[PDB]
């Protein structure tokens, strides 16, 4: 992020549009509240819920919320594994909203 942020700075200093310098990000959406909002807005196409969240109530409602909005959801082991994906230690849930046409 720092190198990309700096590169945008010299681009603006050079007099270039900030939109066209950087491409649209395509990344996993993480964080419990952010993923919950995506499910309620039907923007998440896949939800991965950690099986060992403590307290459990943080994700007990999530399968029902995913089912009502028709979001495909799987319960995956190791919140630690989800953390490694998103560069953190532990992650309660992971949500995939957009992927490239190669991986569609």
């Amino acid at each position: 992020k720092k190198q990309r942020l700096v590169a945008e700075a010299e681009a603006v200093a050079n007099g270039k549009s900030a939109q066209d310098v950087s491409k649209k990000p395509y990344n996993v959406k993480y964080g419990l509240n952010h993923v919950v909002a995506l499910i309620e807005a039907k923007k998440a196409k896949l939800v991965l819920i950690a099986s060992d969240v403590d307290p459990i109530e943080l994700v007990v409602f999530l399968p029902a919320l995913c089912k009502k909005m028709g979001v495909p959801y799987a319960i995956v082991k190791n919140k630690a594994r989800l953390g490694t994906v998103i560069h953190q230690k532990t992650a309660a849930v992971l949500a995939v909203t957009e992927v490239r046409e190669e991986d569609k």
Partner: peptide, 14 residues
Amino acid sequence: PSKHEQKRILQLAY
């Protein structure tokens, strides 16, 4: 584009 990132690239440029 991100306006907060716009402030941050301006900060880094400064």
